[PDB]
Coordinates of N, CA and C in Angstrom, one line a residue:
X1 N 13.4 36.3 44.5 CA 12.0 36.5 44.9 C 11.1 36.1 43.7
X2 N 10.2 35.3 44.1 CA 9.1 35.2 42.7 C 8.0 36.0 42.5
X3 N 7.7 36.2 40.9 CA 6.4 36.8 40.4 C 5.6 36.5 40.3
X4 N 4.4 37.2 40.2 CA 3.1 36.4 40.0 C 2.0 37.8 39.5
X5 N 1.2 37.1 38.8 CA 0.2 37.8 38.2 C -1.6 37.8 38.4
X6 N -1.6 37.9 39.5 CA -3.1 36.9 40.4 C -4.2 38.9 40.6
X7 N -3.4 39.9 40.2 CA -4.6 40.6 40.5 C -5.4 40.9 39.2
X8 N -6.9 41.0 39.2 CA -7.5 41.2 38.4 C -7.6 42.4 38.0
X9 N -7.8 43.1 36.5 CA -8.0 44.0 35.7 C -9.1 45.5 37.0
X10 N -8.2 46.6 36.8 CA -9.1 47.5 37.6 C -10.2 48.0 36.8
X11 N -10.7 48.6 38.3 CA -12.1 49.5 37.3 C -11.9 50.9 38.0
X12 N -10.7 50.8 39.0 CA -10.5 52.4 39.4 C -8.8 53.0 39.2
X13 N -8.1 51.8 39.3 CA -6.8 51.4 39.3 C -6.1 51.3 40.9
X14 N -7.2 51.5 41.9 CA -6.6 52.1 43.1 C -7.4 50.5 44.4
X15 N -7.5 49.5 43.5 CA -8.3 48.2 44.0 C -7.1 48.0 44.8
X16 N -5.5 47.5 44.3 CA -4.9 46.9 45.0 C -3.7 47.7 44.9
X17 N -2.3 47.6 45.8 CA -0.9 48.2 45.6 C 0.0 47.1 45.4
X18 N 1.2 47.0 44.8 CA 2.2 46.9 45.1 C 3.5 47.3 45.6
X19 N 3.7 46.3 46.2 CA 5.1 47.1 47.1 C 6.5 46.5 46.5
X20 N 7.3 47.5 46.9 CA 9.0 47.4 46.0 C 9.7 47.9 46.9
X21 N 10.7 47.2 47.0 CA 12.0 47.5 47.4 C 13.2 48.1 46.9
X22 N 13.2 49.0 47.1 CA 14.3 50.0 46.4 C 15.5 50.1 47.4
X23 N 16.7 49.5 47.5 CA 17.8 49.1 47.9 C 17.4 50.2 49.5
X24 N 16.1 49.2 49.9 CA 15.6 49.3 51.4 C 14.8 50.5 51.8
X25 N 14.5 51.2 50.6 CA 13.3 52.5 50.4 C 12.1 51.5 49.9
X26 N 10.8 51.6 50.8 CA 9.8 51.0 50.7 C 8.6 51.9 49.1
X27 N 7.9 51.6 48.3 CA 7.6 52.3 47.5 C 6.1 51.4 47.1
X28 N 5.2 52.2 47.5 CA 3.9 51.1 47.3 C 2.6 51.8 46.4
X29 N 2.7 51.3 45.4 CA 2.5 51.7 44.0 C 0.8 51.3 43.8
X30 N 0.1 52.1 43.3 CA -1.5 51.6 43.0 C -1.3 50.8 41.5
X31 N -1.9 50.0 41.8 CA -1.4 48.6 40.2 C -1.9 49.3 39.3
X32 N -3.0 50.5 39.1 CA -3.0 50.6 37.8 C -2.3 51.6 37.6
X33 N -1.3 52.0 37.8 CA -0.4 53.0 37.2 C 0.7 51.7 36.7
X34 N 0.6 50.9 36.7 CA 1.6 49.6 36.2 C 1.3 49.1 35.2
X35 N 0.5 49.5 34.0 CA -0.2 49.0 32.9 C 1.1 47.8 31.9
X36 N 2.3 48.4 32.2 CA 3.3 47.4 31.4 C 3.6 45.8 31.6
X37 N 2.6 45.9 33.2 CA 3.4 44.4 34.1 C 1.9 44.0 34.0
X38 N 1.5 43.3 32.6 CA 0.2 42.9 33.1 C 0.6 41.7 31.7
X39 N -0.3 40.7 31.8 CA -0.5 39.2 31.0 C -1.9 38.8 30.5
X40 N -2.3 38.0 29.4 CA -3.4 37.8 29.0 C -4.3 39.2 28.7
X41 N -3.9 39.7 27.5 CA -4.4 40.8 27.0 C -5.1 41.9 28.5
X42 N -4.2 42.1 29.4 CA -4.3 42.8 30.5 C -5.2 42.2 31.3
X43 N -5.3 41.3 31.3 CA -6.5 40.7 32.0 C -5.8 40.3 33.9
X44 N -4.5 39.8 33.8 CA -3.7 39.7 34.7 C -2.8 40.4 35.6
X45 N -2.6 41.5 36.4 CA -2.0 42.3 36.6 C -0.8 42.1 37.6
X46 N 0.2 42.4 37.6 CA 1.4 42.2 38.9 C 1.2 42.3 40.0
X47 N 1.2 40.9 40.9 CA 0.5 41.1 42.3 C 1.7 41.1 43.7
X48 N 1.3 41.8 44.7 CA 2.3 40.9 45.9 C 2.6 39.8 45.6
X49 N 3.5 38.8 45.7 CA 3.3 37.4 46.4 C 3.6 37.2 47.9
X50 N 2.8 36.5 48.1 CA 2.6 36.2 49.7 C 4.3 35.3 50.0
X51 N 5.2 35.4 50.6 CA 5.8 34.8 51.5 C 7.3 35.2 51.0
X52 N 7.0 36.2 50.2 CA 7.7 36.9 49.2 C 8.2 38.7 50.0
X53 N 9.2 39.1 50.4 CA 9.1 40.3 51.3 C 8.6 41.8 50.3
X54 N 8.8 41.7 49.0 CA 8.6 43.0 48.3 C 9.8 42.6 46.8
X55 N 9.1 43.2 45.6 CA 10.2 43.3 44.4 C 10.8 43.9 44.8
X56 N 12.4 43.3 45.4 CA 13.5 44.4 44.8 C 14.0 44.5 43.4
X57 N 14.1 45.8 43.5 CA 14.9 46.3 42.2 C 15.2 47.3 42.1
X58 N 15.9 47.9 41.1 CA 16.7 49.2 40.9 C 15.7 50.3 40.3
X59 N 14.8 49.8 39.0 CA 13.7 51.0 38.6 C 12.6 49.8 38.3
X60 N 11.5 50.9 37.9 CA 10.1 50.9 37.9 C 9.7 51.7 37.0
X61 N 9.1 51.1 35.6 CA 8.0 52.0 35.2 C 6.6 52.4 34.9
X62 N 6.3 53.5 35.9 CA 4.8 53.8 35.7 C 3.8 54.2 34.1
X63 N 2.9 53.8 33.8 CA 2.3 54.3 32.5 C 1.3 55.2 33.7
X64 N 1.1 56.6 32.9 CA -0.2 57.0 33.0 C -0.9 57.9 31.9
X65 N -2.4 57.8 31.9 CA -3.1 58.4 31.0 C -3.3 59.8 31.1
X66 N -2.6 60.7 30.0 CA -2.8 61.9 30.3 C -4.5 62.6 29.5
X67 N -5.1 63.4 30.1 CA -6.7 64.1 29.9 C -6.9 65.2 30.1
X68 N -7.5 66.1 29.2 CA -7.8 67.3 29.0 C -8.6 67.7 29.9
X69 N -8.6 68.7 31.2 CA -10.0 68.7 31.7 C -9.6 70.3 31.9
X70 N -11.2 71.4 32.1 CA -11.4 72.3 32.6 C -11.1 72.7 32.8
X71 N -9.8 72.0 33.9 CA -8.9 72.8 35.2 C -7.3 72.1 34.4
X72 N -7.4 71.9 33.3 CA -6.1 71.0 32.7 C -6.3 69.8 32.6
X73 N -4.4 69.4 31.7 CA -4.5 68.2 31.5 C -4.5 67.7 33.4
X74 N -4.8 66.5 33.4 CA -5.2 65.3 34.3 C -4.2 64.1 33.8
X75 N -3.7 63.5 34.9 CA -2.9 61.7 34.8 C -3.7 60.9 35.8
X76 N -4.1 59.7 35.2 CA -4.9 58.3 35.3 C -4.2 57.9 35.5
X77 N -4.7 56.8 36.3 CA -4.2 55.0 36.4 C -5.4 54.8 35.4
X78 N -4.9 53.3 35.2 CA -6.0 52.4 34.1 C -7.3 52.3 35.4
X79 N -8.1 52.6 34.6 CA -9.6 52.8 35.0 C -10.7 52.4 34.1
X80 N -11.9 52.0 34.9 CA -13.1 51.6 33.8 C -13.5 52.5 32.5
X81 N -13.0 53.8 33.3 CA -13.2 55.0 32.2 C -12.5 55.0 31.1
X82 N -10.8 55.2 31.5 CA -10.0 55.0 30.0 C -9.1 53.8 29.6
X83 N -9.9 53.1 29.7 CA -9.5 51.6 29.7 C -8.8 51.5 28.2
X84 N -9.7 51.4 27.3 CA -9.5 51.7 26.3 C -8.2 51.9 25.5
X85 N -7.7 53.4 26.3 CA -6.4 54.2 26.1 C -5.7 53.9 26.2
X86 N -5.3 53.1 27.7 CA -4.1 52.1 27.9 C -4.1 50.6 27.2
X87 N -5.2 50.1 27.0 CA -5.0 49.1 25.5 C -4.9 49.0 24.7
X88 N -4.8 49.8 23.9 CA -4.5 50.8 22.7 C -2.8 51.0 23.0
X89 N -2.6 51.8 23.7 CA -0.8 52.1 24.5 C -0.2 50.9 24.8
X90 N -0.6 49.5 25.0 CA -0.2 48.4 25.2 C -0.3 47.3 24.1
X91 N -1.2 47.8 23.1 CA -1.3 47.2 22.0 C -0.3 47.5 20.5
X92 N 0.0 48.9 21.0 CA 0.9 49.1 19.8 C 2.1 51.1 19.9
X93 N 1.7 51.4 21.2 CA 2.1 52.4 21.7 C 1.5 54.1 21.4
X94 N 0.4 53.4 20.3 CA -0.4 55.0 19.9 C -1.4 55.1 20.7
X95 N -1.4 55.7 22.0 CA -2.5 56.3 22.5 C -2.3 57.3 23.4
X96 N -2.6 58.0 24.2 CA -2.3 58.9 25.4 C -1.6 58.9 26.1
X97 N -0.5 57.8 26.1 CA -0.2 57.1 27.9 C 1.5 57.7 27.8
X98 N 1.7 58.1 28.7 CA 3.2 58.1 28.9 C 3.8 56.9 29.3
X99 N 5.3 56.8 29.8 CA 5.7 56.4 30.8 C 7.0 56.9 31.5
X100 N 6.6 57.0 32.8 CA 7.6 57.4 33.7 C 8.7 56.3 34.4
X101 N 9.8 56.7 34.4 CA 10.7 55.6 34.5 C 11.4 56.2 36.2
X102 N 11.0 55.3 36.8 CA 11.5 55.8 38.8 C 12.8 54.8 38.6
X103 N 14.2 55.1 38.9 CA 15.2 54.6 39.7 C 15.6 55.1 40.9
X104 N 16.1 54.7 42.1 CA 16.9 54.6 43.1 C 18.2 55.2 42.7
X105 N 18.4 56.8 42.5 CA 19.5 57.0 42.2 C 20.1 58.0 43.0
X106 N 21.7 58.3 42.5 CA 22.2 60.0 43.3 C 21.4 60.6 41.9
X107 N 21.5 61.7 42.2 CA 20.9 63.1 41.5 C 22.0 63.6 40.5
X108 N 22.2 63.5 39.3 CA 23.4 63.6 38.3 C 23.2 65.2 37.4
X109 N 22.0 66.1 38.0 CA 21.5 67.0 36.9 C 22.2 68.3 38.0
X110 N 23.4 68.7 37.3 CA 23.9 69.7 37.7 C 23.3 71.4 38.4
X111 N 23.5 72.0 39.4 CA 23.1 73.7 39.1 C 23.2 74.3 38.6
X112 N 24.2 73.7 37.3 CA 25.0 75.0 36.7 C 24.3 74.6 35.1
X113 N 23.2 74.1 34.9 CA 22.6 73.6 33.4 C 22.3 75.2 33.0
X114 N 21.9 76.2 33.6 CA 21.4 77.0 33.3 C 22.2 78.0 32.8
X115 N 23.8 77.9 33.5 CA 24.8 78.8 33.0 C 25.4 77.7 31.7
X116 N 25.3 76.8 31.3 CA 25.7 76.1 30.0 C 24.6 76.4 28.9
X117 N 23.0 76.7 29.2 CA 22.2 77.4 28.4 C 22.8 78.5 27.9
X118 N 22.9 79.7 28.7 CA 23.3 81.0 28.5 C 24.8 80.8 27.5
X119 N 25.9 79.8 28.1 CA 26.8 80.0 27.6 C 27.1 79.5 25.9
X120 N 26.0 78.8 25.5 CA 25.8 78.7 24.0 C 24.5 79.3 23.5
X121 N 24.1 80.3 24.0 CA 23.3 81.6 23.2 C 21.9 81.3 23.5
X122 N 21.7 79.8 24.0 CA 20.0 80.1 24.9 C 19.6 81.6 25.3
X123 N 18.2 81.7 25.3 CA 18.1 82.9 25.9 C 17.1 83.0 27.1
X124 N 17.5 83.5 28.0 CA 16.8 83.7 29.7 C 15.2 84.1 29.4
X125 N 14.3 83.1 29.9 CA 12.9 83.8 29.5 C 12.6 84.1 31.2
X126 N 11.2 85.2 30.9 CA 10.5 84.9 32.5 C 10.2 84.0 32.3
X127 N 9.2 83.4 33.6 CA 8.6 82.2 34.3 C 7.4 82.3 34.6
X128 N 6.6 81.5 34.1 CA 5.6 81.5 34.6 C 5.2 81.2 36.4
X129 N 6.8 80.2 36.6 CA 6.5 79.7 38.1 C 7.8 80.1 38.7
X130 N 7.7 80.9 40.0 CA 8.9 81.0 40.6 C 9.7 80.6 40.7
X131 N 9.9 78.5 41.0 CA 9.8 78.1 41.4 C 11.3 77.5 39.8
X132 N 11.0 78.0 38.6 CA 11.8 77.8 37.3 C 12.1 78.3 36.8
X133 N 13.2 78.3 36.1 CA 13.8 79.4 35.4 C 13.4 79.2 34.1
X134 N 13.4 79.8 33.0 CA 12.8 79.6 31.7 C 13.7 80.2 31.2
X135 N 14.1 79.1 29.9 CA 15.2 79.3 28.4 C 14.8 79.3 27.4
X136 N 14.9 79.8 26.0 CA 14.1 79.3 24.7 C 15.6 79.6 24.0
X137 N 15.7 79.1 23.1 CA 16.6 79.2 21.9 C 15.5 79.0 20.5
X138 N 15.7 80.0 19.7 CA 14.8 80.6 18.3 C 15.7 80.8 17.6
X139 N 16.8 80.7 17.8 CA 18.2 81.4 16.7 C 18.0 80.8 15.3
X140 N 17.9 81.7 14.1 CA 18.0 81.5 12.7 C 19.2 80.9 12.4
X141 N 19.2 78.7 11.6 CA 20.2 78.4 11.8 C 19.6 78.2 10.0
X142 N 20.5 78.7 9.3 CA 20.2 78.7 7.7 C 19.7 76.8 7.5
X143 N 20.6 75.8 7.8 CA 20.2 74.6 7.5 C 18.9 73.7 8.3
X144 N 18.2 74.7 8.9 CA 17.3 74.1 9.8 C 16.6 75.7 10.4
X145 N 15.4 76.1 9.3 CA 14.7 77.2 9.8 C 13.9 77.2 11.1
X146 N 13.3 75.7 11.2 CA 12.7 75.0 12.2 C 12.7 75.4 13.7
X147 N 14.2 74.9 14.0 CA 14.8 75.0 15.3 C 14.0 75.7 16.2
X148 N 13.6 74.8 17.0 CA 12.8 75.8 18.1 C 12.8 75.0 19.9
X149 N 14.0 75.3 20.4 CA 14.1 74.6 21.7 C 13.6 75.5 22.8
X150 N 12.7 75.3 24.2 CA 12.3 75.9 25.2 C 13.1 75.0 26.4
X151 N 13.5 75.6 27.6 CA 14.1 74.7 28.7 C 13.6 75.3 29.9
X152 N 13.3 74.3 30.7 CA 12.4 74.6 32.3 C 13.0 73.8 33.4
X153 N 14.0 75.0 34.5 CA 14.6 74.0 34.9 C 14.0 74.8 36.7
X154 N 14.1 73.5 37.2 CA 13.4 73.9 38.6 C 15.0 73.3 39.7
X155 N 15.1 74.2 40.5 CA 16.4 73.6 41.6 C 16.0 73.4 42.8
X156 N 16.4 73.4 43.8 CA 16.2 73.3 45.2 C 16.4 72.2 45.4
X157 N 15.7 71.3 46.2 CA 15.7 69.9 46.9 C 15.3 68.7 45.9
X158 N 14.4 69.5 44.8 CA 14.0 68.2 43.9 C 13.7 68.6 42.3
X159 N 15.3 68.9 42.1 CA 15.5 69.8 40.8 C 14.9 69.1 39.4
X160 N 14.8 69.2 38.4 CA 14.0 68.7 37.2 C 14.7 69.8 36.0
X161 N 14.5 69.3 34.8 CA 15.1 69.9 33.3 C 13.9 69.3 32.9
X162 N 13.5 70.4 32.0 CA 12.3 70.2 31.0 C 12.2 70.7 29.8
X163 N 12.7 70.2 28.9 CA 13.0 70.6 27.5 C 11.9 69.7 26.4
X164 N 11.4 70.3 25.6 CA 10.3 70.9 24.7 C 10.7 71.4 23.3
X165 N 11.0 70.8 22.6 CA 11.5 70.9 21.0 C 10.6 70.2 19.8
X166 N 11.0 71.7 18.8 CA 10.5 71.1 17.7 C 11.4 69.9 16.6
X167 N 10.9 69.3 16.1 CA 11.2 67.9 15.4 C 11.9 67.8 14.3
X168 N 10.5 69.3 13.3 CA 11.0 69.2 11.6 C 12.0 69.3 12.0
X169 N 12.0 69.0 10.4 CA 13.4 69.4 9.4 C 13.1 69.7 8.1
X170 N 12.1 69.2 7.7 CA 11.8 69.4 6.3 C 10.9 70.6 6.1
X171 N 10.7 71.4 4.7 CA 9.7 72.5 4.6 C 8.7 71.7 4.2
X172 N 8.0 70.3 3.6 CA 7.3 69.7 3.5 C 6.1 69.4 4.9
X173 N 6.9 69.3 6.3 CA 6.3 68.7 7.1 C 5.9 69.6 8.1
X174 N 4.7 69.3 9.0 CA 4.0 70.0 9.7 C 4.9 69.8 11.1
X175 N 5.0 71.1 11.6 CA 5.7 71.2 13.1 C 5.5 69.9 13.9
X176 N 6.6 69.7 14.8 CA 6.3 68.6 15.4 C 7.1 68.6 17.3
X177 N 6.4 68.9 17.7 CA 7.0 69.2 19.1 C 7.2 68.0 20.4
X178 N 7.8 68.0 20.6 CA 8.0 66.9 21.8 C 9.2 67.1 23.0
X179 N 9.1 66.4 24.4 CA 9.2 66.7 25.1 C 10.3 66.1 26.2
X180 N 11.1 66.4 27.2 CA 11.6 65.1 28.0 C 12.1 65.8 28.9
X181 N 12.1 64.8 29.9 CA 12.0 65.8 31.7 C 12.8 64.6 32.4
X182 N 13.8 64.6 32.6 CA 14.8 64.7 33.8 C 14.9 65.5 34.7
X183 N 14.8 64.1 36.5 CA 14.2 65.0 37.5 C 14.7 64.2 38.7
X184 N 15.1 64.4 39.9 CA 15.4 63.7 41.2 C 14.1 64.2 42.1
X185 N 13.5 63.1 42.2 CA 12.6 63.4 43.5 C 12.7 62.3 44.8
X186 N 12.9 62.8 45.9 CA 13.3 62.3 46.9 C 13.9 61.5 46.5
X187 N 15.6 60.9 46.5 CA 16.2 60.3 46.0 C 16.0 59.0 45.0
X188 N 15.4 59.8 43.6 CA 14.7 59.0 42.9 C 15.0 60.0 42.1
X189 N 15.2 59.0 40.9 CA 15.1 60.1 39.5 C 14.3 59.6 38.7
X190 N 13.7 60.2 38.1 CA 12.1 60.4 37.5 C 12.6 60.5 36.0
X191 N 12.4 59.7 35.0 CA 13.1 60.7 33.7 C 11.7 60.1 32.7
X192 N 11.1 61.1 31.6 CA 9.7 60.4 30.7 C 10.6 62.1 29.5
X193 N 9.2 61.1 28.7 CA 8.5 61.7 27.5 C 7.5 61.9 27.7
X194 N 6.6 62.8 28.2 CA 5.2 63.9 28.7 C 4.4 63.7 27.1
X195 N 3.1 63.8 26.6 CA 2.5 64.2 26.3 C 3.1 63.5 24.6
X196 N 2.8 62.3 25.0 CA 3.1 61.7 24.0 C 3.0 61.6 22.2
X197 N 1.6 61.7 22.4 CA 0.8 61.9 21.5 C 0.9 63.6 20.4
X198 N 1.1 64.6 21.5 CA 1.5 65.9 21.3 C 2.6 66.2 20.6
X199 N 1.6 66.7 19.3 CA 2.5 67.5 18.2 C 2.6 68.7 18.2
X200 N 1.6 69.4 19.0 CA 1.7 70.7 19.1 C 2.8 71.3 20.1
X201 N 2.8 72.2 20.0 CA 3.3 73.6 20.8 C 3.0 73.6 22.6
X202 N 3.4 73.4 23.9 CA 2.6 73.4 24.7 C 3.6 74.4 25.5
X203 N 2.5 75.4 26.7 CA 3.1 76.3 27.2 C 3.9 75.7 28.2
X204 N 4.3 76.4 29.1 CA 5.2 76.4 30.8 C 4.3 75.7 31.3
X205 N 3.2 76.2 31.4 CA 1.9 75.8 32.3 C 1.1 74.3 32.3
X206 N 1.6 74.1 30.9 CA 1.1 72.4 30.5 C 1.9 71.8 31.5
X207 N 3.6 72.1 30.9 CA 4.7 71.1 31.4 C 4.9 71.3 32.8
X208 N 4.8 72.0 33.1 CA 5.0 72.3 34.6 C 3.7 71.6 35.2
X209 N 2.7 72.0 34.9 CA 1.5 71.3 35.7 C 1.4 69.9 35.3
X210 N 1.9 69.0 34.7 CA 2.4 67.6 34.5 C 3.4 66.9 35.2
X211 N 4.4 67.6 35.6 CA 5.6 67.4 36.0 C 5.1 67.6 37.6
X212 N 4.4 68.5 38.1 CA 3.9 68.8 39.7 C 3.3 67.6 39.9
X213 N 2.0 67.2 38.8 CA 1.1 65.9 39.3 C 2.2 64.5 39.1
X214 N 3.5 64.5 38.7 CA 4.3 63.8 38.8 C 5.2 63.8 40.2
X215 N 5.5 64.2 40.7 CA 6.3 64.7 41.7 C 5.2 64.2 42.9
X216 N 4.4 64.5 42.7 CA 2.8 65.0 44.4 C 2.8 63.1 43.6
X217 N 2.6 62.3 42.6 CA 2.7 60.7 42.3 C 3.7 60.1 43.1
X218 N 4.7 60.5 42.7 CA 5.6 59.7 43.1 C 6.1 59.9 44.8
X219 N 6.1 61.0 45.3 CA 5.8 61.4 46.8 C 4.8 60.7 47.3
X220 N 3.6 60.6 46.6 CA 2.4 59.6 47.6 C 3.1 58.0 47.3
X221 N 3.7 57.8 46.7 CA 3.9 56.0 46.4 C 5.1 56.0 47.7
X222 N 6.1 57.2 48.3 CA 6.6 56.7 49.1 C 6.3 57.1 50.7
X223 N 5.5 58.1 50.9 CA 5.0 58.2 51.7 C 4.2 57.8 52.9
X224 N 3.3 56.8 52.2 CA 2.3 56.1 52.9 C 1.7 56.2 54.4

């Protein structure tokens, strides 16, 4: 199947879609959440081709802009608004943007992650959401005071692991926190680094409400 690059730069991200074939799962994507497939300093973006049935392929990765608002952080497609952000994220990788990586897969993240927590000394936290179970590990490890892991794992039909760790190691350097989420959503596995830019500390409520506006994403691209 051939490529081509014929759509013009958005100003909402939601001008045009592309469609993919995922070993015969249809998946029709708003181009600006595709900030990686674009040519001439983004000026060219990944289009249909006409006579062309759909990209097949095995994965897909979405960039989106994450934003502080009110009601929480917020995820963008490339827009007139944060244009900027994702040029910046495309220019050298320091700005807001994540990226989410969609494959066509079986679902490889066990039930039993939570009894492999417990069984090396994690410790069972409440939840802020019913819906997850919450782990933290704080244990005093003499060669590494630092150590500070949290785990958020959701089961049912479209399970996810969300682990949230600190970085140091040195007593010179300032905390450093970051994040990664492995996840099956309707036979798709979703796997990122959230909140890229973020050195801080972030609650259940961040990760969880990032990971929901990921899930309700990737459900509208196959739903149609």
């Amino acid at each position: 199947e051939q490529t081509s690059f014929n759509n013009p730069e958005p100003m909402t991200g939601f001008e045009h879609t592309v469609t993919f074939d995922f070993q015969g799962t249809k998946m029709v994507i708003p181009y600006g959440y595709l900030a990686r497939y674009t040519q001439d300093n983004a000026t060219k973006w990944l289009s249909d081709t006409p006579g062309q049935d759909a990209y097949s392929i095995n994965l897909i990765e979405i960039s989106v802009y994450y934003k502080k608002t009110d009601q929480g952080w917020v995820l963008e497609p490339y827009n007139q608004q944060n244009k900027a952000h994702f040029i910046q994220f495309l220019r050298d990788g320091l700005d807001s943007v994540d990226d989410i990586v969609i494959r066509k897969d079986a679902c490889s993240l066990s039930t039993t992650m939570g009894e492999r927590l417990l069984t090396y000394g994690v410790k069972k936290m409440p939840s802020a959401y019913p819906e997850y179970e919450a782990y933290e590990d704080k244990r005093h490890i003499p060669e590494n005071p630092y150590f500070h892991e949290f785990y958020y794992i959701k089961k049912g039909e479209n399970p996810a692991i969300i682990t949230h760790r600190n970085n140091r190691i040195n007593q010179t350097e300032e905390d450093s926190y970051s994040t990664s989420v492995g996840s099956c959503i309707n036979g798709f596995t979703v796997q990122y680094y959230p909140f890229i830019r973020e050195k801080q500390q972030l609650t259940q409520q961040e990760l969880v409400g990032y990971h929901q506006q990921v899930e309700q994403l990737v459900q509208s691209f196959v739903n149609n």
